[PDB]
Write a protein that binds this ligand. Structure first.
Ligand SMILES: Cc1cc2nc3c(=O)[nH]c(=O)nc-3n(C[C@H](O)[C@H](O)[C@H](O)COP(=O)(O)OP(=O)(O)OC[C@H]3O[C@@H](n4cnc5c(N)ncnc54)[C@H](O)[C@@H]3O)c2cc1C
Ligand SMILES: Cc1cc2nc3c(=O)[nH]c(=O)nc-3n(C[C@H](O)[C@H](O)[C@H](O)COP(=O)(O)OP(=O)(O)OC[C@H]3O[C@@H](n4cnc5c(N)ncnc54)[C@H](O)[C@@H]3O)c2cc1C
Ligand SMILES: Cc1cc2nc3c(=O)[nH]c(=O)nc-3n(C[C@H](O)[C@H](O)[C@H](O)COP(=O)(O)OP(=O)(O)OC[C@H]3O[C@@H](n4cnc5c(N)ncnc54)[C@H](O)[C@@H]3O)c2cc1C
Ligand SMILES: CC(C)(COP(=O)(O)OP(=O)(O)OC[C@H]1O[C@@H](n2cnc3c(N)ncnc32)[C@H](O)[C@@H]1OP(=O)(O)O)[C@@H](O)C(=O)NCCC(=O)NCCSS
Ligand SMILES: [Ca+2]
Ligand SMILES: [Ca+2]
Lengths: 378, 331, 260
């Protein structure tokens, strides 16, 4: 029910101390070395995270998505790449297996994930099939008591580091999106090979790369859901993840704001600190309102999912609005640091580069607009 | 009346200086009460430390020589002091607030069932009521409270080392030697000392450091920092520095202080040749005590220093070393 | 093997500053936390729970808010929590405090009792050994490592110059130090259930064994006569000579107490 309960307070207290002590002083080392944070994954796992909103019987912690989203928010507040490693793991990889996988499947794949012993990833986007998701070109065909997989997925978060991949492929092209099926694919199988980790603008710690399937043989027992269900499985999976990313934006926005408030008080120009000029205040005001506004939209989506009310539109309003809010606020943030903001000794610029992707992936802000307007026009 | 008793501390048969300071304050408290001053000496072969105590103001020297006191272990010391204090009946008992003092006193005052004030910094007996006003700093140091022990005797306190001032050693005065016998049996020797190992002072991070000697651009070279590390040794704190020095290759980033290094709030900060941009000042503005050396009296750092010295680094620093190295050579 | 840890919820007095433009100390914003020596002890106990199979119980004296301390401790790995609240304790000094806590321990099965060296708000570092005296147990302070072998505890005792390697037959009280270990984080889910189910025991005076004339101010030998706030730092002097200069430095240092 209520979100100012001491329970959640106590989670937030945990998250903040983990963030400041374990994540914050790695942030830019991962930006500059463009390196995956293996250490803060295993550290993260140990303190419970990596399975926050899954039943204990499957190796998760017994939490709710609100306490999970709280975690993504409080991580991206200090380091955006780390935020996505989690949100991608819990929302994109773990959840479809939790929701659509049977009992054998939830025991062999869902438990290693929820316990933090392994790392999860979701592969849907292809070079010729991005926002138009149904133009999948990777094929799955059933041969004996194995499936054979051929094709490529580009831009997949938590590629190389990840252990379990929830990939989508056409099993009947001649039915469109009623022809996609979803498969659980373990890193190590013959034929499953990786790309080169991409060079990107800001989320440089997150390992993003290509999945390559060359006559890749898979047990038929790895089909997640029914044949042809994959489209709907991926669609509903993204509804959840949009919440994670919206909170990622939120984290970023709130961290960038927290940093400027620190600075604008220390820095004196013209005899008085920067915080004493009407424009820096009014800008801070406009920023805090956008962040607060966004907070409400993010968690109302979460709340909806936990109560099992429908949540896909709610999640899209949170993705659109926090993504924009992240971008505006980080930008105003660097501005307010002045020259020093533009240097990489301070973190605000990295937050600004981090922010931009929150308008793009897990569905672009245009896709969100398509969603919101669609449930409005009938 | 009673007497004013100071519990002496010795480590491998040398008196700790805080003891002799405490005998200092002891002669004042005792003179304000019209009573004399007593010393509790505890150890194994502690003979001769006695004459020292006499010289530093002690009038009675209560002595407990036993090989159970050879090495400090809480209980033999507690039992001994209880017996000896209970026997003298002091108006006031002072321990030095050390790792021994702050371990031994609370246990003694409990067994007596009196009251104890810890880590004190000021003592004096009120004109009216003649109680010992014991003032100690609390609440992480942001508070100064004055506590009294209304009814129970002896009035007890652990006192901060370095705060009370000693007496002038008088080689003529001998004192009375009390030669107090104490038995020590099994229910007291319960803690057994397997090994006494002495290791070194354990380098610490600058964020945690107590004193910082901080290098600026002013020093002018990497080996020129040795003179700082030399001084850093004599005060115990570590060396930190401005981004200037780190950039120039003189120190690890781990020693950088300021908006993009480390924020440090130590008890002392010595700025050696730092101009003090806001990038640096907002790193250490909150230190308890800041001392700065610069050639430029228009340096902005002086705008923050509690003691702004204007001089050459390479001529102040060695003079500060010579003055202090004779300081702890003599005392 | 039974381990009882005495944690005290304190306001974090590192984060206290005095506002120069009001004079007093900054009132709010200071979070309440497990005093750190105490969190450290709690760490050493849960370490023992994981290695030897011990049973960690945790107790705190204070007002209802100190519940949060026990819940933090529980989610870190403790098994039991006791919050001890009573009007009776109002004004307690370290005698009337150690005796209160001692009287509870009369009713809590123990083999090791762990407390922190110093509570960062009263700053006396006196309750640990006074509790041990009341209960007539051997005590070890300034603890830098804790190991057990069978019926005995092995402890390293930290000193100014040396450090002792010690051995005691259980029972015993140990005061633990803020560094010495690095305290593990809570587990989610441990937080979720510590709040969703809530096994935390709240004891009143009825639940302890004490002479009530040993509780609270009326039971406290020492008492607070006057107490005043820290003086705001002064102006600061800027000086021009030489080698009289280092004397400039050292006589102001002697003033703030480092005469060595
Ligand atoms: C760092 C990173 C990590 C990623 N991780 C993953 C991952 O783990 N898993 C995964 O499945 N995918 C992942 N992706 C893919 C990402 O979700 C896609 O980039 C996103 O869906 C947009 O698709 P696209 O790049 O092909 O853009 P395109 O579809 O080429 O679209 C580009 C632009 O055209 C606009 N546009 C497209 N179609 C329309 C239309 N009909 N009407 C109006 N405007 C339109 C879009 O809104 C956008 O501005 C990742 C991408 C990046 C950059
Ligand atoms: C993005 C960014 C981040 C930064 N972050 C930090 C940071 O975290 N920390 C930091 O410290 N700086 C930082 N800076 C730099 C900061 O602004 C200054 O450059 C820094 O204060 C330079 O160090 P300094 O005072 O030692 O050197 P200078 O300012 O060059 O001052 C040297 C001083 O030494 C004096 N002097 C020289 N020789 C002698 C002598 N023999 N005897 C006495 N006095 C002498 C001179 O009068 C002068 O006052 C940052 C800058 C940027 C752009
Ligand atoms: C300004 C001020 C000055 C004071 N001066 C004195 C004085 O000189 N002498 C004196 O006897 N009293 C004094 N008191 C009273 C004293 O602070 C309280 O009695 C307090 O209960 C015990 O002191 P402490 O908080 O310093 O604890 P400490 O003795 O520092 O704590 C020792 C350990 O005991 C345990 N512990 C302590 N309190 C609790 C608790 N409430 N619940 C659970 N475990 C606990 C913890 O493990 C802690 O690490 C003073 C109080 C104030 C406000
Ligand atoms: C899904 C996809 C590929 C296109 O297919 P889709 O959006 O499902 O379109 P349809 O289902 O065919 O259209 C639905 C129709 O059913 C109609 N309908 C509903 N109920 C009806 C009823 N009882 N009787 C008659 N008609 C009805 C609707 O009116 C609607 O018609 P309109 O076009 O006039 O609105 C694309 O639109 C999309 O949204 N992709 C999102 C991908 C994403 O987020 N990718 C990021 C992954 S990266 S980590
Ligand atoms: Ca490296
Ligand atoms: Ca005894």
């Amino acid at each position: 029910m209520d979100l100012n309960s001491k329970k959640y307070q106590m989670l937030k207290e945990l998250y903040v101390s983990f963030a400041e002590n374990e994540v914050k002083p790695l942030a830019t080392e991962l930006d500059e070395e463009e390196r995956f944070p293996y250490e803060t994954v295993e550290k993260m796992a140990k303190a419970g995270m990596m399975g926050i909103p899954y039943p204990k019987e499957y190796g998760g912690e017994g939490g709710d998505t609100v306490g999970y989203i709280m975690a993504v928010e409080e991580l991206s507040r200090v380091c955006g790449t780390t935020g996505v490693i989690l949100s991608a793991h819990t929302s994109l990889g773990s959840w479809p297996i939790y929701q659509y996988g049977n009992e054998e499947q939830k025991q062999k794949f869902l438990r290693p994930l929820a316990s933090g012993e392994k790392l999860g990833a979701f592969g849907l986007t292809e070079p010729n099939a991005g926002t138009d998701a149904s133009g999948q070109q990777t094929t799955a065909v059933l041969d004996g008591d194995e499936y054979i997989l051929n094709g490529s997925k580009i831009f997949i978060t938590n590629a190389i580091a990840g252990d379990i991949y929830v990939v989508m492929a056409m099993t009947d092209k001649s039915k469109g999106n009623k022809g996609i099926s979803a498969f659980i694919v373990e890193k190590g199988t013959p034929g499953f090979s990786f790309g080169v980790k991409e060079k990107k603008m800001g989320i440089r710690g997150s390992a993003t790369s290509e999945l390559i399937f060359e006559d890749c043989r898979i047990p038929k027992e790895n089909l997640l859901g029914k044949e042809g269900q994959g489209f709907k499985i991926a669609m509903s999976t993204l509804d959840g993840g949009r919440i994670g990313i919206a909170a990622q934006a939120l984290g970023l926005a709130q961290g960038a704001l927290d940093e400027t408030v620190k600075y604008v008080k220390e820095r004196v120009q013209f005899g008085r600190p920067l915080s004493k000029f009407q424009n820096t205040q009014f800008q801070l005001a406009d920023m805090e309102v956008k962040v607060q506004a966004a907070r409400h939209l993010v968690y109302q989506a979460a709340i909806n999912k936990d109560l099992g009310k429908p949540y896909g539109v709610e999640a899209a309003m949170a993705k659109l609005f926090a993504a924009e809010t992240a971008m505006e606020v980080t930008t105003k943030a660097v501005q307010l640091h002045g020259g020093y903001g533009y240097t990489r000794d301070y973190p605000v610029e990295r937050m600004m580069r981090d922010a931009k992707i929150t308008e793009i992936y897990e569905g672009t802000s245009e896709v969100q607009r398509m969603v919101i307007s669609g449930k409005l026009l009938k | 009346m009673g007497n004013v008793l100071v519990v002496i501390e010795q480590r491998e048969n040398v008196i700790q200086t805080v003891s002799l300071e405490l005998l200092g304050k002891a002669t004042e408290i005792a003179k304000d009460y019209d009573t004399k001053v007593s010393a509790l000496l505890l150890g194994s072969k502690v003979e001769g430390l006695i004459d020292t105590l006499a010289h530093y103001g002690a009038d009675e020297v209560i002595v407990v020589d036993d090989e159970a006191l050879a090495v400090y272990t809480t209980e033999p010391y507690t039992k001994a002091a209880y017996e000896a204090i209970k026997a003298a009946d002091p108006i006031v008992v002072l321990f030095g607030a050390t790792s021994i003092g702050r371990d031994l006193a609370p246990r003694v005052s409990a067994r007596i069932h009196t009251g104890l004030t810890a880590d004190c910094t000021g003592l004096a007996v009120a004109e009216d009521t003649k109680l010992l006003l014991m003032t100690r700093p609390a609440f992480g140091g942001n508070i100064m409270a004055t506590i009294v022990c209304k009814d129970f005797r002896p009035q007890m306190s652990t006192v901060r080392p370095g705060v009370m001032k000693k007496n002038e050693p008088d080689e003529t005065k001998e004192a009375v030697i009390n030669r107090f016998k104490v038995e020590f049996n099994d229910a007291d020797k319960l803690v057994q000392v397997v090994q006494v190992i002495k290791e070194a002072k354990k380098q610490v991070k600058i964020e945690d450091a107590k004193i910082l000697v901080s290098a600026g651009r002013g020093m002018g070279g990497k080996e020129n920092l040795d003179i700082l590390y030399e001084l850093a040794e004599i005060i115990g704190g570590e060396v930190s520095g401005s981004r200037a020095t780190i950039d120039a290759g003189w120190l690890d980033k781990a020693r950088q202080v300021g908006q993009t290094g480390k924020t440090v709030r130590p008890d002392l900060y010595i700025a050696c040749g730092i101009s003090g941009a806001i990038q640096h000042i907002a790193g250490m503005e909150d230190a308890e005590f800041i001392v700065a050396i610069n050639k430029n009296p228009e340096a902005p750092i002086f705008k923050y220093a509690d003691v702004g010295i204007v001089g050459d680094v390479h001529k102040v620093l060695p003079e500060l070393i010579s003055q202090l190295s004779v300081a702890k050579e003599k005392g | 093997m039974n381990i009882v840890v005495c944690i005290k919820q304190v306001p974090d007095t590192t984060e206290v500053k005095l506002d120069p433009n009001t004079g007093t100390l900054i009132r709010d914003g200071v979070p309440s936390i497990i005093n750190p020596d105490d969190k450290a002890g709690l760490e050493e106990a849960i370490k023992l729970k994981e290695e030897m199979g011990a049973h960690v119980t945790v107790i705190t004296m204070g007002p209802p808010q100190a519940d949060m301390a026990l819940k933090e401790a529980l989610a870190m790995g403790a098994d039991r929590g006791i919050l001890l609240t009573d009007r009776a304790f109002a004004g307690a000094d370290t005698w009337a405090t150690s005796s209160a806590l001692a009287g509870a321990l009369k009713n809590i099965d123990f083999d090791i009792i762990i407390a922190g060296r110093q509570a960062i708000d009263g700053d006396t570092a006196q309750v640990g050994p006074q509790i041990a005296e009341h209960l007539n147990l051997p005590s070890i302070t300034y603890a830098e490592e804790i190991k057990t072998e069978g019926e005995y505890v092995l402890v390293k005792r930290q000193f100014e110059d040396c450090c002792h390697d010690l051995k005691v037959k259980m029972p015993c009280l140990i005061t633990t130090l803020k560094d010495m270990n690095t305290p593990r984080y809570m587990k989610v889910g441990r937080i979720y259930d510590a709040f969703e189910n809530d096994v935390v025991e709240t004891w009143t005076v009825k639940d302890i064994e004490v002479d009530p004339s040993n509780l609270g101010l009326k039971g406290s030998p020492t008492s607070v006569f006057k107490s005043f706030t820290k003086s705001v730092k002064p102006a600061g002097t800027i000086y021009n000579e030489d080698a009289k200069t280092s004397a400039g430095i050292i006589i102001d240092k002697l003033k703030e107490k480092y005469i060595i």
